[PDB]
Amino acid sequence: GEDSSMDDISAYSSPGLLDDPFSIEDVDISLDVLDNLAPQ
Amino acid sequence: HDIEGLKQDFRLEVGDILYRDVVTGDVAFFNRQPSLERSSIGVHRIVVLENPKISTFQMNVSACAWYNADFDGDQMNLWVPWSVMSRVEAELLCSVR
Amino acid sequence: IVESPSICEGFVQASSQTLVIIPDNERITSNVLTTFEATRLVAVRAQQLAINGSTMLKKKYSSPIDIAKQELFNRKIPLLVMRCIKVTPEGQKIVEIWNPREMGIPLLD
Amino acid sequence: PSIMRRLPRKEGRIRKSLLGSQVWSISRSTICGNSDLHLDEVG
Ligand SMILES: [Mg+2]
């Protein structure tokens, strides 16, 4: 009960935690020219 | 053949293909992303800026309505047709008029 | 009973077609070239001039594109427009052949 | 690495290689104003 050699690694983090509305996935625009989307 | 590697030819032979520099009056496809409208790609007549200090694509402010563009840092693509078939099609179909 | 596949089916090669030209008095499509058709005619003629260079145009021009445009405008272009109307299941390919030297040209110069 | 993972997403085979294309003979630069150019002209 005191052993820590086989503790879950994912339990050291904070425990616990379809389309992204903000991701430009269907927009085919170059990543070097994204300033065209600036609100201006 | 490169043009520096040949200098003994007095002229060109009929049938050769010469790749020449882009001059004033050539048509060019001019595009701003995202291309949401049909006017997002238009064909413009090229004016070559002889000042070596200029690196920008310059256009009239009244042409910005085609591309939804402005001059706050937008970048636009430009390719010049070289083949005859695409260079005919640029003039007759894709001209911004 | 539905037995093993036979050679009568399994053909990948589509059978050849017969080009059926609609008689000139029964043509339904417009007698005016579309902008697409005129552009295609000029482009094809200009490329072929870049290949051959033989034209019957009286005036002299320094570009294949100018020669092709003037051939279209002066009704001297050696090309035809074939408008494919239908492909019949019995093999026929019904098309309309249009002579661009006697059609209306939409382009301007 | 798998054969069928090459297809699906925006960076996949269909959307990146077939529906779009890297091309030669093209240029890009910042755009600028010029009131001496006609509407159908580009500097
Ligand atoms: Mg901007």
Explain how this protein is built.
This is part of a larger assembly, with 1 copy of chain A (40 residues), 2 copies of chain B and 1 copy of chain C (109 residues). Chain A is largely without helices or strands and 40 residues long. Helix content of chain A is 0%, strand content 0%. Chain A is rod-shaped and about 60 Å long. Chain B is α+β, with helices and mostly antiparallel strands and 97 residues long. Chain B contains 2 helices and 4 strands. Chain C contains 2 helices and 3 strands. The interface between B and D is medium-sized, with 32 and 19 residues. The structure holds magnesium ion (MG). Magnesium ion sits between chains A (35-36, 38, 40) and B (70, 72-74). Chain D: Belongs to the RNA polymerase beta' chain family. Chain D: This is DNA-directed RNA polymerase subunit. Chain D: Part of the viral DNA-directed RNA polymerase that consists of 8 polII-like subunits (RPB1, RPB2, RPB3, RPB5, RPB6, RPB7, RPB9, RPB10), a capping enzyme and a termination factor.
Give a topology summary.
The structure is cut from a larger assembly and holds one copy of chain A (40 residues), two copies of chain B and one copy of chain C (109 residues).
Chain A: no helix or strand
Chain B: E1 27-32, E2 41-46, E3 57-59, H1 64-67, E4 75-79, H2 84-92
Antiparallel strand pairs in B: 1-2, 1-4
Chain C: E1 18-21, H1 35-51, H2 64-73, E2 81-87, E3 92-98
Parallel strand pairs in C: 1-3
Antiparallel strand pairs in C: 2-3
Bound molecules: magnesium ion (MG).
Helix count of chain A?
Answer: 0
Please report the two chains with the greatest interface, counting residues with C-beta closer than 8 angstroms to the partner's C-beta. Answer: B-D, 32 and 19 residues
Characterize the overall form of chain A. rod-shaped
Instruction: Determine the number of helices of chain B (DSSP H or I, runs of at least 4 residues).
Output: 2
The SSE order of chain B reads: EEEHEH
Biggest sheet record of chain A: none
Q: What kind of assembly state do the chains in view correspond to?
A: part of a larger assembly
The backbone outline of chain B, from C-alpha atoms, is elongated
Secondary structural class of chain A: little secondary structure
Taking the alpha carbons of the first and last residues of chain A, their distance comes to 61 Å
Q: Please estimate the helix content of chain B.
A: 10-25%
Which value, in Å, is the CA radius of gyration of chain B? 17 Å
Q: Bound small molecules, which ones?
A: magnesium ion
Strand order of the largest sheet of chain B: 2-1-4
Number of strands of chain A: 0
Number of DSSP-assigned strands of chain B: 4
Q: What structural class do you assign from the helix and strand content of chain B?
A: alpha+beta
Which percent range fits the helix content of chain A?
under 10%
Strand fraction band of chain B?
15-25%
Major sheet details of chain B:
3 strands, antiparallel
